[PDB]
């Protein structure tokens, strides 16, 4: 797990895309948002990493406004699921319209925090994976 995060660095870094790691110190020391830390029951198949919104996004500056500068990607290998959450800044009214059909599922505790869910089979392939999620 420490070499799979290690090499999801370092592809990040390939995408020139600043992270830091949510240890178990970090996680223990609930720092992080709860929900993310919802579900993850002490399993080491559950990875979170803290994502920069500029970096994510290779420098895209007017979206900075919209959403949190700091983003989260959860990986679960025994579901093999993919989460990106993010935080709005400020609270839209659009967040009360329907938005089931683009896949984003806003966390019922924080109505100002969303995420989109997906399901990997490779990880060598989860840049594009990003890219979707970027997409989105």
Do not use: W
């Not at 178990?24 to 920069?52: A, C, F, R, V």
Request: charge should be neutral.
């Amino acid at each position: 797990n420490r070499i799979i995060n290690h090499m999801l660095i370092d592809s990040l870094n390939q995408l020139e895309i600043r992270n830091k790691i949510c240890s178990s110190e970090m996680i223990n020391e609930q720092k992080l948002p709860q929900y993310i830390i919802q579900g993850s029951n002490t399993n080491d198949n559950i990875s979170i990493i803290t994502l920069e919104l500029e970096s994510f996004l290779e420098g895209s500056k007017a979206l900075n406004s919209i959403l949190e500068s700091s983003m989260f990607l959860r990986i679960d290998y025994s579901n093999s699921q993919i989460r990106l959450y993010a935080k709005f800044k400020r609270n839209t009214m659009m967040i009360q319209c329907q938005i089931d059909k683009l896949y984003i599922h806003f966390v019922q505790e924080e109505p100002l925090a969303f995420y989109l869910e997906e399901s990997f089979t490779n990880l060598g392939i989860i840049v594009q994976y990003l890219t979707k999620f970027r997409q989105k």
